[PDB]
């Protein structure tokens, strides 16, 4: 059901353009602009370790004079941490997994990330076999709701925390594949560094405020 | 039968002038729906990501439809 | 009642030489400058988007107003 | 001519179209709208360290209150920190609405409002010779960094670092203020311009700090 | 040795006439397959993923079973 | 514009199309392999689009004149 | 210069019945292989990287070698 002179014509048109239209991404000014964005984003995921390593310090401290009045308080701090940290943890790991798959076995992630492949953060993630996007999205659930069963959550309380580190996507599909379907490797590596961001921001907040609850029983 | 006679009454549809001038006209001007979506989608311009599904749907219509057609012919003169 | 009936017209040109000149050049004229447009898509120069457009739009033209050649006969031979 | 094949043509028939959905998935990723998720991350990172820094200074200025006679020249200096950093986070917090005003409209909104990623907006907003800022934003952020150095007690600690990302000398040929933004669509510049009010946050962060280690040993 | 004594009853029914039509048969629902496991991981609706790998699946063994034939024509005057 | 009969009829000429075929495929494989290249990081790829696509544009340009091949009826 | 010789023969080898043959099977088999490499780019196979290599590499070639192959018009008056 073929035999036209010029549908022929456009489809082999339509291929060579559309073979050669895969190269395409953004700018090397809007990578450059990820790598810039997320130095900062390095930057203060930094900030926020020590800043959280720093206020354990008080608990420890409390703990040690007071432990009764921080029975309830102390053990909910320390478990906090420890899946706060298996969680930044997994993605780090996974962030090196994806700098590895993109340029090779030898590359780094920090800053070594030459390259700015688009099916290299897809095959990591969007991967029907052994994804961990499927995996993070189960675990990052797992962490949120955990800290609104840590502490009595209220709009003006941290009711943005689980605002920030949501699920929610357009319409269909959740951010498996809105935040690693054929995006540039960089722009992976940039919005990993935004979850871990968000979760230091997230846990210094819980953190925060189970300190607050406990100066209130304290005081 | 019941699959068969509709089959069948495609089939013959598919081989009139005015069944396959329909389907010419189809085979046209879906290609040409592909080509302005992907124009649209491509420039990320408005209201041009549905027309490539449009145009898309269409060309799934004619490759199911074209299953039901015979083309076959060998010269050796 | 002075629109439609224009069909019959409109094939006669289709079926005429100087309308598949006209058609072929216009064709071949929009395919170049959709290249050269894809060229300057991918490499990052400053008038890509503006005449991808206008090659795209002209391809579809042509195809819109193609979609009326009504003559594409398998011609069966039932010879020995 | 120059179309036909033999077999391949089947080939061409049905992969134009999937090469069509490739590009199509390509096109629709988020990469230019992940500039918006960063945006709100690096924004609620800003107003926190707001909250954190000006909770240092209320500390700095109620010990000022009691006792002045340890602590003058630190608090004034700090003050003046305070009132520098302000101006100038304020500045780029008026500047990047300009950005936005032909990005969609003058009721523009510098949040979540874009409505589309133009790259010919910044260049004529900030990089021209009549109403281009550029030269006003690299002079004026030139001012912190020399300020946090040339008036400061310098340590391997102290501003080695941030300068990092308070760069003021980019890279060969273009300049700096066009080095950042030339060809760069809208919602990147306010991004861009998000992480320089952060990492002016951080900077105002660090210096507090500094000061609250030389006025307790002090 | 005996290599070649596995593929010698595939070129006449490759050119079957019920072999053909086979052929294009399997051919038109693997393109359409193909084309509407597309379509539902552009709209992001779930089992596309599926489609398209049975279609992929199906194409490349078309192509590959067709690649032993022998087709031949010209003229002169 | 002027006499241009001679390339219409060096693109008609049996010893036209053989180069005009050449170079279409010859700027396609250019074309794809340019694009390999771009999408690998690989050295003097992102130039080969260019002379590739160039080659695209000046043969579909010369190609604008041919005459048609003319539908036959029976 | 001397390559316009291998040139010249390998252009009067591909006329012929035996070589003509394989073009069918170069042709077949690198549509294969690229619609194996579109499917791991498309859907994101593991090491596909490495196969979307080899499949463009292949249809590079199915192009280049094309290039050799002589098309007649042969009007009709």
Known sequence: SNGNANRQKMINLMYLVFIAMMALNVSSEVLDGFDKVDKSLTSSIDGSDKRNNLVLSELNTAYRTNPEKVKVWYERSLVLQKEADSLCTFIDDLKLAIARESDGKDAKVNDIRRKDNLDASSVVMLNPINGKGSTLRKEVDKFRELVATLMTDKAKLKLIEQALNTESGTKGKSWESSLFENMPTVAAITLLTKLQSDVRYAQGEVLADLVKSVDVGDY | ?77
């Open chain 2, 1 to 77: 039968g019941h699959y068969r006679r509709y089959k069948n009454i495609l089939e013959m549809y598919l081989a009139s002038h005015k069944g396959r001038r329909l389907l010419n006209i189809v085979y046209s001007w879906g290609a040409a729906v592909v080509i302005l979506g992907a124009l649209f989608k491509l420039l990320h311009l408005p209201m041009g990501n549905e027309m490539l599904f449009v145009g898309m749907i269409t060309e799934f219509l004619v490759f199911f439809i074209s299953g039901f057609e015979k083309p076959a012919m060998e010269y050796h003169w």
